Amino acid sequence: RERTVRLQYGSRVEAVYVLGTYLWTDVYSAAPAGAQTFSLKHSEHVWVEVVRDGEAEEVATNGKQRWLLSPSTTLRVTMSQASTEASSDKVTVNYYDEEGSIPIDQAGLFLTAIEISLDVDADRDGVVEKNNPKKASWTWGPEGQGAILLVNCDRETPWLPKEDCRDEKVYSKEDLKDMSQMILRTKGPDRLPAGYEIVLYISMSDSDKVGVFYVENPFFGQRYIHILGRRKLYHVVKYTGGSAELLFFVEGLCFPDEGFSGLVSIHVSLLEYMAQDIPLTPIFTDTVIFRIAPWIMTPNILPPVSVFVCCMKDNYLFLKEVKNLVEKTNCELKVCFDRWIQDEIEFGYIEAPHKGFPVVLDSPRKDFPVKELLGPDFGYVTREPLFESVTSLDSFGNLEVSPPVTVNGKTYPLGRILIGSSFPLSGGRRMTKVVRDFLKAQQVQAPVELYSDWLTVGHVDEFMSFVPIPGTKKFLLLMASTSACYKLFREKQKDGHGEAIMFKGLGGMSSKRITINKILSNESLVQENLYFQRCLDWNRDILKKELGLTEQDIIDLPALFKMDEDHRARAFFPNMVNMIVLDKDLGIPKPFGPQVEEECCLEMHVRGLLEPLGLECTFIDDISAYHKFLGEVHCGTNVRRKPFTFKWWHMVPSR
Amino acid sequence: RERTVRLQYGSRVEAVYVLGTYLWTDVYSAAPAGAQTFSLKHSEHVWVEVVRDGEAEEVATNGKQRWLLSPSTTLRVTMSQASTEASSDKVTVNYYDEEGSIPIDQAGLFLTAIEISLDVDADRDGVVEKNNPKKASWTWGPEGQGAILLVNCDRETPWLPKEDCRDEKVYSKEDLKDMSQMILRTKGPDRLPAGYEIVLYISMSDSDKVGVFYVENPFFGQRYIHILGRRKLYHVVKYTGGSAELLFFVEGLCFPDEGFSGLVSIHVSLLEYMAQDIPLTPIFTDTVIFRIAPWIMTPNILPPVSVFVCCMKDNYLFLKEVKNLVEKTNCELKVCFDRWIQDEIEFGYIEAPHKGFPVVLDSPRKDFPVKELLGPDFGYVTREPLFESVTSLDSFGNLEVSPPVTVNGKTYPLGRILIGSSFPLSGGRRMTKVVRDFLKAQQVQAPVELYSDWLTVGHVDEFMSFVPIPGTKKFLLLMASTSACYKLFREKQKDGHGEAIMFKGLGGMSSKRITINKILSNESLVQENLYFQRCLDWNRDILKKELGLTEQDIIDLPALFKMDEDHRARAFFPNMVNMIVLDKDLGIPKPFGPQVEEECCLEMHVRGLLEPLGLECTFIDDISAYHKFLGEVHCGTNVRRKPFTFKWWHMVPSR
Ligand SMILES: [Ca+2]
Ligand SMILES: [Ca+2]
Ligand SMILES: [Ca+2]
Numbered sequence A, B: 001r002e003r004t005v006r007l008q009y010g011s012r013v014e015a016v017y018v019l020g021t022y023l024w025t026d027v028y029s030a031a032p033a034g035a036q037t038f039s040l041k042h043s044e045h046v047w048v049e050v051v052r053d054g055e056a057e058e059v060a061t062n063g064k065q066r067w068l069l070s071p072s073t074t075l076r077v078t079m080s081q082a083s084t085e086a087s088s089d090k091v092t093v094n095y096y097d098e099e100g101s102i103p104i105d106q107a108g109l110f111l112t113a114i115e116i117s118l119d120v121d122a123d124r125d126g127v128v129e130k131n132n133p134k135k136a137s138w139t140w141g142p143e144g145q146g147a148i149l150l151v152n153c154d155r156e157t158p159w160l161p162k163e164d165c166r167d168e169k170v171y172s173k174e175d176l177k178d179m180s181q182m183i184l185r186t187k188g189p190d191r192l193p194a195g196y197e198i199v200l201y202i203s204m205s206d207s208d209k210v211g212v213f214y215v216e217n218p219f220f221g222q223r224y225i226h227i228l229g230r231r232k233l234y235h236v237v238k239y240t241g242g243s244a245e246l247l248f249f250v251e252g253l254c255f256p257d258e259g260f261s262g263l264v265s266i267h268v269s270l271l272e273y274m275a276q277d278i279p280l281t282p283i284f285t286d287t288v289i290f291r292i293a294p295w296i297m298t299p300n301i302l303p304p305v306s307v308f309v310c311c312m313k314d315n316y317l318f319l320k321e322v323k324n325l326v327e328k329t330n331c332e333l334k335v336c337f338d339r340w341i342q343d344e345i346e347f348g349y350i351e352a353p354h355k356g357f358p359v360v361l362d363s364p365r366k367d368f369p370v371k372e373l374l375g376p377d378f379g380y381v382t383r384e385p386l387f388e389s390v391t392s393l394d395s396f397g398n399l400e401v402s403p404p405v406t407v408n409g410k411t412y413p414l415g416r417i418l419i420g421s422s423f424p425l426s427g428g429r430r431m432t433k434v435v436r437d438f439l440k441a442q443q444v445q446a447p448v449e450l451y452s453d454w455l456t457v458g459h460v461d462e463f464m465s466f467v468p469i470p471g472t473k474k475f476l477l478l479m480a481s482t483s484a485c486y487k488l489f490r491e492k493q494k495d496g497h498g499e500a501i502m503f504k505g506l507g508g509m510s511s512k513r514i515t516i517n518k519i520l521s522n523e524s525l526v527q528e529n530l531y532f533q534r535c536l537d538w539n540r541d542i543l544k545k546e547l548g549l550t551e552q553d554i555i556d557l558p559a560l561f562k563m564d565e566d567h568r569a570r571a572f573f574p575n576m577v578n579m580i581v582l583d584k585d586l587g588i589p590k591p592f593g594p595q596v597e598e599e600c601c602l603e604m605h606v607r608g609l610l611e612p613l614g615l616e617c618t619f620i621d622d623i624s625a626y627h628k629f630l631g632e633v634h635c636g637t638n639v640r641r642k643p644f645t646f647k648w649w650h651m652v653p654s655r
């Protein structure tokens, strides 16, 4: 970087030189009128070139050489090392008139060289490298660079209700582990020359996106000073001489969102004092950029860590069977004494090269948010509509994510988020804009809308799920199918089982005496379910298109629905597709289907589809404690999973 | 694209087939219980494959072949040509039980094939190609594709005050020349089968960004029907059989801006009627994308078309000298009987492959906008602050643009917009956010802020300009320089000219008796101008950095300023840098400098700098009619230029 510093007529100029720049110096304006030629001297650590109309010649420290004074003959001045107390760094120019060799005037430039660099971990290894030339930009991909910042959305200590980033304070040194390091490195003499200061600053816009802390170690203990952030746009730095480093810690306050790309900047400037009432001049500025890490969800293929379960204390069969299932795995079981656990929360995560933690997204309200999961390295985020009203499609049974897929040659290494919606011209329900905008803004999961509004509850988890194919890297899409159910029931009827009773053992259903015959002879129900299969198939097509799936990737599970007053579907028997996936082990809702030879024909059919693939099926009964099934699921489960091995910053999302 | 169509148990399915897709067909669900095998027949124009667990085999029109019924044995159904009235397009499946070869049931699929394509000029040649596979995206660059739309911001007829895009109506066929063509091409039989319709639609969000018109030619004359746009989100299309095209014309209503990327979409869907109270199902959807063309400014290097001038009727010397100057060129002179022409307006342009026109940007208010330039192929756009108050930095003397430059290897083929500002920590003036956001959003001119707030008026045009180097492809940056002025005056003083008088012929200045001696002996004025040179040099450095310029690209013109109460600069004598550039011919403000040998030494110095380069200098006197110079320029000029030859869509801007 070339910087302009002119000699001053008759007088001397003192200037700070920042390493990494160089000066072009006009010697012509300072020359007295009528002066003909000039000569120069310079000190050992200052390199001087005479540049005549573009041609540069290096000049000795003490020469007698003279050049003609011209506006197009100038100096180029360079320094490679910072000044010390032992330094006298200078260039002096002597001027001569036509006759005589004794100087008629002199002008001089006194320099103090300093190093100033604001450094971050741009190369994404967790340590802060010295002056990465790419630190002022942010690029995606394995070859990409620029520093990454976490939203510090967890909570270090229990004594306050709020996430760490909601204030300007740090109470605990553990908090600094969540932050990104930024070091201001300087080198120079004992003090800056008179009239200079170094200042760190951010824009007003970024002031609600970041906070920056400095750690002091005074007499009575470590303390944490907020130097940049909400209502603090600049900080005057205390300069220390010699080679010095100041360590800062940076926290993100906000996720990427509608209107915020996630990128923020921090600057340091060397300022020069001019006069009173005149603003200080930014002599040198160095900038670093951070990108705030996105919130990322976890598909069912990922390794399970903890199974969170909610039910009533007396649903014993449910708790026993879930406990049994989880005992086949290495997962933790966590129980709370009832659908809020699947509907109100989605477990995501955030990651930076130095750290990562799980983060809960809280569904919009339910008159109160569930914040009780907020804790050390367990974060919280929520979005609420300002105007738009919430519907069932805002529940997180309506929020899921695919396994990694490749679609028309484009890879989605983190999978793609799936949310249920209605048709564009329908006037139907849709998830709130505020949540949709949030998911879209995270960018790395490239969300897809499916059609869920044909269902009364309206959730994608009612009709589809994903399971791994054991011993491989592949997966299957499972789809609810009414046609599969009618085919199976018609077969059992032909086989002599038409009088087989459903809902056996649910005493509240007994008086209805529902049999295969009764179901198959209901004409209006057949028509309704043909229509629901059209709805399922429309979704099948969107999923095949947007996930790059073929029929080879899909298994259909028998399902049956009943239509409500709105022409929307509710489950006739429990939806088996919405299942707990722990690797090869599947907790499947117990369907209570028609009994043939004392086994449920739905259970037997589903085992016949899944077991050959090495999937182990356990049927879980959540409804027996309620004595009947009306289409409503009472209990809930949510599985917190390990994050993807693939680092999100290694993706290259579309423009 | 694979689409799911199932056979129905016991009955026949009728479906529309859209060319460019194909069907996968489940024959298993429709099979009666106990059926063993199936056979199939199909018509001449329907291709049928039996797919058994992924392996596909083509099947004859009438075969007797039978396959085992399995959920994993399905059909793949393809058609390559649209149905006519002569068509019977069908597939029929027969089912068989274990014993006997006579079918026990049959299920069939009756097809009507149609072509539906919504087409635009994606390849950017001005004609609408048939089904460009890239029409649903928009990419930058010479290899890029996707269709382009102009904001239709001009006005076809004088009888209405408003730009064409402010309403939903088209009164004149000339308006259609500004719009982008979009054709819905279809092929099929005399009518769509019962229960289908074709509908065009847009999102609510895009409804204030576009309008779409269809031209009808009824008995009494051509008429223009608004089918999509403000308060019209969909249009049901009238289907015509055989091979048919419907031509639509699309207009943009809004420039890219903060929160609007410039991209918009239009969709066509084939909808299927299900029942009453049930939304129609989108069987097929085709999408095209448009990008709205950005507003682009013109640097001084571009060929001049028209010179717009404003002054008082009696400034005769000004009008004569401007007329003379323009007579050396091929430009039009346009006069209005005074700084508003440079301050209130910036002439830009817009371009699409089919058309382009100049567009005026109107500075924010001046209690009233200047709309009187609005006319046929001369457009208008303005931005007004909702909250923020306007300052002098919002005037368009503060809005300029560089010639094409390359900076650190990155090319800016349209140049870079330049606007004056204050330092980040200064609390100084800055152009309003609404205008800055607009300029940034156009993207192709990548704006740079300079430091203008050291000037009382605060405009970049006060201190810098660009001129072409005649007979080359190169250009120079011209900078105001106080050091150049002091050097020249000190030389003339040494030469015996200290008593040389400035402002000769301005009678209102005579009593002041301003001489070279008087100027040079004013100590406080020297200090002020040293400070102003620091301000100029700070700008010189930003310009060299952001435009990729060296000292070889820069000429300094003598200038002098006086400081006001705010420590800001006003011109001491007219600023010569702000000049009319018509190729090699330069109209330069007459400085009224000290007379030496009956010529102005400032004029002679400037000719000495510029004339060797082949630049022809004419000094233009706008102040003699006012008898004095207080630092204010009374007249104004603005030159409308030819657009860049380089097409903006061939650029590749940063992410
Ligand atoms: Ca590093
Ligand atoms: Ca805190
Ligand atoms: Ca924390």
Ligand SMILES: [Ca+2]
Residues within 6 Å of the ligand: A154, A156, A174, A175, A177, A178, A376, A377
């Ligand atoms: Ca933590």
Ligand SMILES: [Ca+2]
Residues within 6 Å of the ligand: A342, A346, A396, A397, A398, A399, A400
């Ligand atoms: Ca969920």
Ligand SMILES: [Ca+2]
Residues within 6 Å of the ligand: B120, B121, B122, B123, B124, B125, B126, B127, B128, B129
């Ligand atoms: Ca074309």
Ligand SMILES: [Ca+2]
Residues within 6 Å of the ligand: B163, B164, B165, B166, B167, B168, B169, B170, B171
């Ligand atoms: Ca109109």
Ligand SMILES: [Ca+2]
Residues within 6 Å of the ligand: B152, B153, B154, B155, B156, B164, B174, B175, B178
């Ligand atoms: Ca028009």
Ligand SMILES: [Ca+2]
Residues within 6 Å of the ligand: B154, B156, B174, B175, B177, B178, B376, B377
């Ligand atoms: Ca026009």
Ligand SMILES: [Ca+2]
Residues within 6 Å of the ligand: B342, B346, B396, B397, B398, B399, B400
């Ligand atoms: Ca301008």
